Write a protein that binds this ligand. Structure first.
Ligand SMILES: O=c1[nH]n(CCc2ccccc2)c(=O)c2cc(O[C@H]3O[C@H](CO)[C@H](O)[C@H](O)[C@H]3O)ccc12
Ligand SMILES: O=c1[nH]n(CCc2ccccc2)c(=O)c2cc(O[C@H]3O[C@H](CO)[C@H](O)[C@H](O)[C@H]3O)ccc12
Ligand SMILES: OC[C@H]1O[C@H](O)[C@H](O)[C@@H](O)[C@H]1O
Ligand SMILES: OC[C@H]1O[C@H](O)[C@H](O)[C@@H](O)[C@H]1O
Ligand SMILES: OC[C@H]1O[C@H](O)[C@H](O)[C@@H](O)[C@H]1O
Lengths: 103, 103, 103, 103, 103
């Protein structure tokens, strides 16, 4: 298995690592039909989403998607610094594949 | 996908954005039959609800409804400021569709 | 939908509102067979329970019962002030139907 | 329904109350096959477990077992004082049936 | 049942105890397909993973796997010192079987 978020990120196509090194500026969450998602933004202006579960996801990712959203909420509420984000860049806003927190 | 609560709120009928810029004043939770819901109010007295799951909700919203309630509870407890709320105004109290929080 | 806990409480038989205005004094949780419940007490001596799931509950209440217990534990741990409790008084201890929190 | 931990503990055979009046000293959690459990210790020298779910448990105890482990973890992390523990004395280490915390 | 993490760990093949006595330096979580996992690292340079649920795991471990990840995230956020880790050394990074934390 990969040992860092970057090794993991590189195993997928259409992804890139954004080094954030900052807490989340804003947290947005929706329970509206077909837009069950979360959006985060940083002081930098960067904006990312955890996509609505869809046909592209396998069963195993379903539980992971709910965990990622749980993680973003608590990270935001605790003003925890995010290290890096591995995101899919073929989506607007870019989609979160993985996250690392340090410091 | 939409990248802000405003973009998201613009995709639905019967909705509007309320700029709260304040923490939740009170949190109310019910497990009473047919009233399994949450109600929050702000200092202004303005009140909102997360609706009891019903026919107007599609399957993907089931987990989202539960998450929204988890979110309101923890934001109340942490005295976290709510920035805006996208709500359906065809319900009383107005019904929460999305929420944003900012630091 | 009702706008306050008192409004909600009035829709049911065998209920009453207790104005608490205090943090929880003790929290008790049991996983013993047929006694899977939670009991809380206040400096006032007032004791309340979240009942063991049973035939008196409809499907929609199963998740609500679990959430209420989650709320009481975190409310206790954070020393969060409870405003009111809507309880069924046809049980001993009085059974929790809804709770409101405000400082 | 019982109103106190002592009251509840008394309804069962092979159980007894331990007055802890202390925070948990150490917390252990295992996901090893057939040993999916939690072990806690106190400066007193006492060790206790939340048993691996098994044939001795009824269905209604399933969610309760998972809740108890959630409780012990957060109790440990917040250095919350435990009042009493109701345990089955017919297991080694003693098995937790109910817990109480007081302010 | 075992009373300490070392006893427990010894009940399995391909395991060993890593003594940490330090908080988690970084927390990494992935929702990427087939890589739904968590990786943690320490200032020592040691790196560990909670494996993607797989054919080696029995059902009782599935729920336990999700708990371990919940535990690692909150331990990280609270900067709680970890005492020991029982890990499977036939995986890279080594795989977490159990954790222990002490006051
Ligand atoms: O057959 C195996 N038995 N045990 C004993 C308990 C158990 C587990 C599963 C089924 C029945 C009984 C094992 O502990 C065990 C471990 C083992 O290791 C693989 O799985 C673990 C995760 O449990 C981890 O992924 C290791 O790296 C794997 O080798 C294989 C077979 C086992
Ligand atoms: O066929 C694909 N394979 N992988 C490798 C792991 C995997 C995933 C699903 C099935 C079998 C193996 C992919 O990672 C992958 C990704 C992919 O991208 C879409 O889905 C992701 C979310 O997983 C994200 O939404 C992207 O924006 C999408 O393009 C497509 C096919 C893949
Ligand atoms: O999905 C929730 C949403 O459902 C319908 O669209 C209703 O008009 C709204 O008030 C709200 O209940
Ligand atoms: O839904 C729970 C509720 O069910 C009935 O209404 C009972 O009379 C109450 O005591 C309470 O248990
Ligand atoms: O329900 C749990 C309980 O089951 C039986 O009663 C056993 O004797 C106890 O040791 C305990 O395991």
């Amino acid at each position: 298995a990969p040992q860092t978020i970057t090794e993991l990120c590189s195993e997928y196509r259409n992804t890139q690592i954004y080094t954030i090194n900052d807490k989340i500026l804003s947290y947005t969450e929706s329970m509206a039909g077909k837009r069950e998602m979360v959006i985060i933004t940083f002081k930098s202006g960067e904006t990312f989403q955890v996509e609505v579960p869809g046909s592209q996801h396998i069963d195993s990712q379903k539980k992971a998607i709910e965990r990622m959203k749980d993680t973003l909420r608590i990270t935001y509420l605790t003003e925890t610094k995010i290290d890096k984000l591995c995101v899919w860049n073929n989506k607007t806003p870019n989609s979160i594949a993985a996250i690392s927190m340090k410091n």
